[model samples]
Target: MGLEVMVGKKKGIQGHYNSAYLDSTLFCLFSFSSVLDTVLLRPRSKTDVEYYKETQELLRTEIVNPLRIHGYVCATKIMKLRRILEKVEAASGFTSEEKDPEEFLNILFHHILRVDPLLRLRSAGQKVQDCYFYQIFMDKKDKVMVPTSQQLLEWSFINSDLKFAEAPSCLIIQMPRFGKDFKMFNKIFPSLELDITDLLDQQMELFAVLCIETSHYVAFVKYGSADSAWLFFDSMADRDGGQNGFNIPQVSRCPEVGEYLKMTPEELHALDPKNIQGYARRLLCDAYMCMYQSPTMSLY
Candidate 1:
């Protein structure tokens, strides 16, 4: 369960995370991990009464079960975390936009050593692991270029002027979706794991990587466990968008993801990213943020 809550878009009134006492998973919160959870939880008294009632069910379910996922089952600890996050409800940062994953993580982990600037460097034509914001023209008008897991590394070095002399316990990468106004590669489908050994400078094995995407935010977290691992969480999956609310968010185990996991990089790169379905699709397209744990945390 690699979910967490983030702020929402500008809506209701003149730029508030929510309207009255409603909406926002941690603010956009999660039905499960989208940052998806208190990792996600429900919105506090931000939006309005009507919005809150509408989305409450899904939020509760998403947060509840994922709360049971692992150490996440450590309910008191999590609720404790929620109480801490509740303070973000009124974060006065110029919102409604521009909080990077690293920024978000720092907010999440400000108190811990794990939050140490993932890496701070100057330049050397970097070989990257994840991207912060990438700029490639899809059409200079209609299409935009986004990266693949393979390209994620590519982006770091392509025009990079920085290098990491050291690696952190966890690493976070950002994507290149320029707000709601521009998004193209969201059209392609895609890594169910991240191979950062080479970046760490390993033939390292990626055990679990939590993929986060936002714009109403959603997460393709590796749900389930062991060989059966292949589930994703979408807070707004109930895309029926429906009446006052959307469908409850879903945590689905997909064979496609399992199959994708079996793919060699060439095979994966070869697969028609646009045609693949389930979590694998989101894995490539919607990835706005990636959280990579250190060698010790993710791999045994």
Candidate 2:
């Protein structure tokens, strides 16, 4: 072989496992690693040894996969990651590999996160609902279109309808949709940058993005400088799975994914609510979760 483009926990190595059967594995790997890449990178201790072996499967994926990548790595997907899935399958313990992040996020926060209750909500007076209501026709264009991160933040603070006495060190915002059944928006924009100054004094920088499509989930994460320094990581992406027992996906630089990002506020909002196909199109534009870290609170 002359030369090759290598991308992952290790360079020059293509995926060797098939992730076709891993869902919880990807969810944990995607969110946990995104928020605590460094923390998890630390060799597991006696305490870390707890929780299902699946966790380690992903952690190993991280270490073996590139925690960081530069220029461009082979976005070429190898195979799906099922090492943990297969090990997790004890006598058909769990067959269905599909899980919504909303459901799994709860589990991750409770049992996995380095910090418990990453979000704390308190009310001194006047609950958030005490503010206002959504003026659907008034504030909206009544047509289908993807909204920018900033736009969503505007509404986010609006919906929050209250101010935080103090800001947390980190902010993790989940982009939503319901069980493939309820598609949130026809298109949800991934604006290059998000400014949350009005919503909060602190500026938020995009650190990670988890894009979920029906059965499979992948993430485009900024392990380097900022959002621009992103490498697409799909745990189940497929490639040549030589007689290997498993297939694992690693991070690859795929700018073609911009088609999925949209990068513009949703425009087809006017589309009928019954348009399931449109909703599917919107799902293409949507993401499962998004996390932002405050440079000021970098440690947090």
Candidate 3:
């Protein structure tokens, strides 16, 4: 794998060995994987190492066990998990090529988690819920305007030929115009809380964001329940071993992202010299996947 990053003490999967191109997509998948780890796993161990072992077992059962365990370390563990993931669908491009995170997620969920489709669209009594993600579509006229993800969601629904069939328990929205040289908006403010009561007759809370820049991926995920805060994940942050050794992934608390969520891009620009380690720009400009979870549905 590329680098071994984590959330708190939770270790994450790195991109495929000797490949940099796939991080753009792998990081996205890793982000969801990490977040899902949080929601699904309930601890039975104490030490970090033990917790890791426990998590591996759970990952095996929930994801891989359906296919096939151990106190296995990085090399063998990653190999087995990667093989299972790749084998599920085509199993080739994932390790050998580059693909959109959206495509990767659709395949993973459809074949593995088997969660109800994330998006359901309908028009003229024709229903389509095959897609696991909702792609945000924007009009060319608004290319110059910066909009919040909230408004973008509404705009997409209002202007599109299809309407949401039902509110999704886990809403995955891919930003408009991604993978293109130019973005529809200079920057998009991630809506900390996305309310779709009017549009979908339902609502959800933002929990995770996956972003990319220069073909490299990173993630920001919410931690905690009553006192939630944001944590950032960069799979290839640093290297503990030499050139040939493993890369040390880094995860750090970034509560300032919450503060930035309270400010507009214009507000951020008006302030003095930039701070927050340049996260404001990333959250605004590079966001690729904005994940929301419905308050009513509990998937535990």
Candidate 4:
């Protein structure tokens, strides 16, 4: 199906926002969100594909697209948004090699708003505040699912054969912080306080990526599915594993590494964003297919 078929067009003024254009943007966000939800929150059984797709589609229509429309004009602003999206994707082992035209246009929609002097003055502070709120809300959810330091260490050995000297945690940490400047702006322009909310929301989205990566690693070790193990390595390569210096074997030894490593280049290429979501969908489907073919691993 075409992009238009996947996400139907809008109506009236809403029609001004093209579905194809909006889907491009939403897909990027959705991909990032999926990676995060899978890695950090909880692993959805392969059977949950329909529910996962629906949730992501809804998020695109409701949250991400609206933000872009509200602030669309500034190139630099768009670039900033793109950078965040790209960074999150990279962390998930799904980096876009070059800027995809559709993805660029989608992000540009939001940049236009950020660079508008009027919009900037109106939205910057509010954006910052929103980012903080998003972080807090997600953090609460994560705290519930993520085991305590003691439990993490124990689970490490129990779940994976690898022994953990300490609890496995993120090496690089970034917490959302809204400061006095943001508060001052909100106080001055109560009308634009929602901008702060937007800022917090953006941060929350980024944090979700981190959470997913954390979960992916943990899942890799626990399941020892080769595909998941490779994915964990792919994710690490985007971060610290440079082209020449990367070590797939070492990564496989990670407590979260799995044993399902039969991925092909076609599969990876199929997951490319430029090809749209088909590649990702296929990859997930294939992984599940492999799981069913074998009795040793559970689909969940």
Candidate 5:
């Protein structure tokens, strides 16, 4: 009866392991026997200790060394965690042959940490490394990596139907004084006018404040007029809606913006185009310096 139950239809048995006499007791007996079959009948291949050792050496030499050279020591540590994964695979019969290297690396680094108590230490270390790297590198730089000019040009031309070469009139609208003459400009260069008002507006406001502030400072010092100072202050306040206030905070107070402003022209050029904050800083500094050096000639 037990044998019949063990190989019963309820077990969904369809193979040679299911016999007509099997029952629940036989099921229990055969379950143990099946485990023993895996233990006994399974061919014992010699542990691929040499292969594992070679893999470890390759990891250290090929992956870890280059990563260390690039200041990616945390990634090197992640490579070390791969040994644990290797061991788990060896024991579970789920060897490297069945898995993708990158996917395996991700699973070892991220997923296994949940259930494997042994991974706690390395997992915590990985977390700390991630946070440290994030604060130091990720936050300091914009998330998106800007393409090189060559890449930008390539992408622009790749889809010829897009007509990227047509130079949308909107691009000219990026220039402050030039953008205002768009109607006349568009008539002369009719193909170019699209609304780049927002882009130009930002640039205009940025340059305008820098010019007004620096010019006011110069005027106040030269003529000692309270009116000049008041004009500068009021203009800035009006533009900012008093949100940023009058006193230009010290560079230390706004490190990200300040650092950007201090970047040399060469450094600015080295920055990616998508780095808007850095670009803003460079523009602000350029405007400030230009205004500071300009002769205080009144247009009126």
Candidate 6:
């Protein structure tokens, strides 16, 4: 029911603008909302999955079902979600106004879902840790390099002892740098299939990507079963009517991004943006969070 809400649906979250304060709940919603469907559809009781079954049940009952039943979400339910978010305020560095989407996600999974992806040092063998997202780190260079997410992951794990205790059903990876101020690469290609088969071996497939441009958040989601079925979502793209109209979320087909998914990094890097069509800049530069799911961890 939760996945049904956002799977290629074109509806926007109403911005609660009161007393010069614009509610940033829209960003929080955009960041992790798609994750709701992905996580909920999976069985949480498995010990290896590292998700809190009770918390998953709580989200389903309190947040998801309400949105599913009502044509529109009420303020009460939004507050309920915020109330849970309050728990991670200290750790996530969230304020009343705005927040980093990646930080919000880390807190949501670590605190709200009660997920401890870490396995720490084991007495017998390699120290493995289940993680929410793998962060990419790069040095500032004169010339920019278009690196793939798989290569970045491999580079990140080269010096570290952290291994996946078990393959997580959901894997989110953050692109390098803080924001627009400092970007390591002009374009970082997201790998459609993250092959981590060497370490306990499970190939993760990309499903959704969250991007930020000029402080606003948007999403590129894989809507249907096919790799080419991609859709772009902007929560505040348009207004319903005229001057005083409500926000109208926009969802449009983005087959071009799908085509990029099929191409190699060299092909993508060599292509001129001037010659490309439809959101080439955002997909290439603004991608903040890349989400991948383990095919082996399916419930149905």
True-structure RMSD, every candidate: 10.7, 8.5, 8.1, 20.9, 31.4, 6.1
Q: Show where candidate 1 strays beyond 4 Å.
A: 1-66, 69-104, 111-114, 124-147, 184-214, 223-228, 236-247, 261-275, 295-300
The TM-score that candidate 1 achieves is: 0.52
lDDT of each: 0.40, 0.43, 0.58, 0.23, 0.23, 0.57
The lDDT-based order of candidates, best leading, equals 3, 6, 2, 1, 5, 4
The residue-by-residue lDDT of candidate 3 on 1-300, one tens digit each, is 211223443234343353333333333333433434332344444433323444356454543322112111233344454454576555465555655676556655555554446677775447564577788886858343567778888888777655667776667788887465867765777876777766642557777788876477777765433223676766566666565677544566677777777777667545543454555567667788888776522232
Clashing pairs in 3: 2-15, 60-65, 86-91
TM-score of 5: 0.16
Task: Summarize candidate 1's per-residue lDDT along 140-176 as a digit string, tens digits.
Answer: 2332243354454445544544445555443445545
Say which prediction, candidate 2 or candidate 4, comes out ahead on TM-score.
2
lDDT of 6 by residue, 126-150 (tens): 5444455677664435333788888
| Residue 156 alpha-carbon offset, candidate 1, angstroms | 2.3
lDDT of 1: 0.40
Inter-residue clash pairs, candidate 6: 117-130, 197-201
lDDT of 5 by residue, 35-148 (tens): 112212223235433334444444444433432233112222333444556665665322323222224533432343321121111121232111100000012122223222
TM-score of 4: 0.18
How well is each residue in 1-300 modelled by candidate 4, as lDDT tens digits?
112112211210110111212222222233212322222223344544334433343334444443234311212222333344444345421122333222443233222212111111112223211110111101223322222222322232233233212221111111221321221011000010011121111011111111121112110121222333221112221212355442111112232111211333343334433443311322222110010011122233
TM-score of 6: 0.71
Between 1 and 5, whose lDDT is larger? 1
Clashes of 6: 2
